[model samples]
Target: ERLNEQNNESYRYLRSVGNQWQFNSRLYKRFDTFDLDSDGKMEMDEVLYWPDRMRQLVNATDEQVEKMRDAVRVFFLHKGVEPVNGLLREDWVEANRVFAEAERERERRGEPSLIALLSNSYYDVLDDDGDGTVDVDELKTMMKAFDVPQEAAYTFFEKADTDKSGKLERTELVHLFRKFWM
Candidate 1:
């Protein structure tokens, strides 16, 4: 139940919209930011830069960076990106909208969303030792990397352990994330 997350408020494609190419404003911006060649699309090679990007932004370690690369490969490359001209920016954005609509439909039916699905991957990334739960030391390293006030990392971890059990499970993690991080 430790908390440390960085939300991409600018990459705003977490919901459903029309399928038109021009409507991919958020994706268009993402493509523009990454596709440096002005190519209007992306490939696996090009997309792999996210690990480097994360290190710069979050100051994560080699261990976390390794996990991040694996996370990228698993979450993006195998996510069925186009094999030819790379990933069509609009099509990828459209897929997100479709899923966003799907998530919304699920919500309407009184079911939970899969947004936490990715959170699981991220939790493993921060868990440090793969013990299935995050202890305060792991939480501290992660928080320090995120530039949280050094002293307050412990405070945050203490606040997160709702059970006072010296560790944080995903439930506690989720709530701390809700209350503090995201």
Candidate 2:
């Protein structure tokens, strides 16, 4: 066949680029991270929480995050999520393909890196009681609002509270964000 006549070197190069792109894409990476249950499907709540996490991580505005949410919902709709109320792994992959292309375009245009979008001012936002530190209750409330699993939130708090002070200082919180900023 004509396909067999194609240069193996060219095919290898294409495969390498494809793999690199997938690995570098935020959506491809986040899908697995957010799928906490390892059920290979992202439920409605999970889909809803994604934009909030993006907003927190990237400091995006409500309108901007909503647009991203819409794209994800559309992907689910296209994949027919009526009875299940969720997106399967294949659906996530399909959505990531679109997002990855946009990410590439953003890169081409010299968009800011995700780390650059984060700001220390967000600490005040998380410190609901206007206290200088973020306690587990404050973080738990915020995570609950975003539908994050309590167990994961507790685990994160434990890790972030390296001093075991039952609260995250500004520096500690910043350090935690930096740990996952990639």
Candidate 3:
């Protein structure tokens, strides 16, 4: 296939470049640093740790981080905090509902539906301290990074963390979502 051919060409090109003195001198030194134990191959941990190296390589500025954050927000179609008129809660809910309905329609028509990308599983991940409930402190720890009204956030968490347990059980969370679906 064309993709396979292109990949083959790239491999050949890289091999040739690696053989060159200048490229080998620069790239190989960096590669050797990354492969600290000289195992001849990089592991996942080494690759994961490369972000700090990359930041050092580029001397990434705070503005660069801000731009990266902005890019991610735009990619996810989330409006910045100042753009309250851009996307409201209802718009987000309706967007998700429409996407789900479209997938169901696709399946009904014998077409492959898109896999679920959005998940409520985030709550489980955020309950890192393993307490039965996420208190206001926990909620703030998870969400305070976002620029939003703290009072509104408090109200939202209070409503979700029913039974005044300051944490959400699976059933309580599901019941809250069931109300949304209704």
Candidate 4:
């Protein structure tokens, strides 16, 4: 599915987080944090760390981890914005505009925003056990590895688990994404 998804999308650019100003600042913050040297770009070595941590956390089989790593690398390399260009902050900002425009077009056509599409992919990563729902540990682990960098993920996960069943479906996750991401 990711192979197909990758074929259709060049880069998984970040979507609009709020207004243009807020979005660009947050995006730049990530770029700076990842880019370490003012080399003005991100190497695969730097970019792969979180995914590597996630691969460990998922406890997947060796084969599964290898396949995922390849797919992720393919994604990073395919987009000129990241490893292809060593991922400059300037290029990333431009890429976000391009992706945001495409997301608008998607909505105009009654399709999900491309950001939303990737959120579904993200949910898959967060689900950990492939059990169709997320629990507290899964939220904490994925949110941290995904760079949410806040106590907000666990705080909201508990709040959003409306049934107290320790299981949160996509809708609850969506609510939380809106709260934190928007």
Candidate 5:
């Protein structure tokens, strides 16, 4: 409910900016991460594997992974061969190039990017114990609910727990989230 509330506020802010925003270059980098075989395209398996991969990368719940899948399907279903086959990298690049152009034009017209409206408060949802800190075990449980691999969770925890204090405060959690986009 709170995440939805924040999204609603974000949507309002997005609208105030005329809903203009371009995804950064990191978008392509993320896509590249999914294109594991480096075949210049994503096959059905690659597409389907995204949610599982993202579950580990972001420690997202199944629902959150589904949300990501839904958004991708909205784009790829129409363009994919027979609506379920796959998508070419060139097509992805072209589509984003057009989107970037549109965003640039909007910026030139004095519109703001919706990116600025995003919030990182969802970190609270992962702080299940309500102790104002996220420990490795808590993170493991959260990721396990999402089906994230145990090894990946351990690796991520090691990297994200910068202070070696075996816990993540709000600032560290925010930094971890930011690593996804920036």
Candidate 6:
């Protein structure tokens, strides 16, 4: 049965909170890394040409590009940010609402889920040793392989593995996913 919006009010509120946190914690890092110049801003020049850079730097293929778009969309929604076609806006209320609706629609069957794509792709890319787990050294190597700066990769891993497990397990992944995927 279709439930009233009011019935989902608490879930909506919680979801919004979760999405925002995820954007800030996970997607923002990837965005920042892509910005390249550390200008604290992104322009259309940067975003539109991101695929080319991905091809060169991360060896990203056309399929990966499609996945990346989903990842970016999720990140923006979670962070309560907006693309405004090309312009960036920080209006949280409008952003959150748009994100909520967009997320619902995008998640319908036959559509790709950003979290699944990213999680799967990253695992594939980072598991260089084929050990089924990513260690710090493996992570660094993978980031470097993707042309991520060493300092940035270091910081990213440091923040991502909050428990100092020296590896990223399901706990860390789930924690980050919840923080960044809602």
TM-score against native, each model:
0.44, 0.40, 0.34, 0.60, 0.41, 0.43
Ranked by lDDT from best down, the candidates are: 4, 1, 2, 5, 6, 3
lDDT values, one for every candidate: 0.54, 0.53, 0.39, 0.58, 0.51, 0.50
Whole-structure CA lDDT of model 3: 0.39
RMSD of 1: 10.3
lDDT of 3 by residue, 1-182 (tens): 11111222222322343422111144344445545467654343443342322233233355543443333333233111112223223233333433344444545667532231111333343354656554565445434433334455586677877777767666555555444332
Candidate 1 segments whose C-alpha is farther than 4 A from its true place: 1-106, 109-115
Better of 3 and 4 by TM-score: 4
Per-residue lDDT of candidate 5, residues 128-171 (tens digit)? 55677877876776566445565576887787889888888766
Model 4 residue runs over 4 Å out of place are 1-24, 36-38, 43-45, 61-83, 110-113, 147-150, 158-166, 174-182
For candidate 2, write residues 66-168 as lDDT tens digits: 5556654543333223225455665555443433443344456586322223324445555656657888876675566456765577888888999988989
Global fold similarity of model 5 (TM-score): 0.41
Model 4 lDDT per residue over 42-158, tens place = 667776775687776676556556655555565445333344436566566654444455455556667664334334455666677878888787877876776676475677778
Count of backbone clashes, every candidate in sequence: 3, 0, 2, 1, 0, 4
Residue 62 in model 2: lDDT: 57
Model 6, 27-103: lDDT tens digits are 45655654656665554445544334443444445566566555544454343332443223333233344445545
- Estimate the Cα RMSD of every predicted model relative to the unseen true structure: 10.3, 10.2, 19.6, 7.8, 10.1, 8.9
lDDT of prediction 5? 0.51
Q: lDDT per residue, candidate 1, 1-182, as tens digits? A: 11001111112222222222222365456556656476766676766665454455444457667765665554443232444545565555544444454445556767653444434545666676777887887666656654455577688878888889998888777666545312
Candidate 5 colliding pairs = none
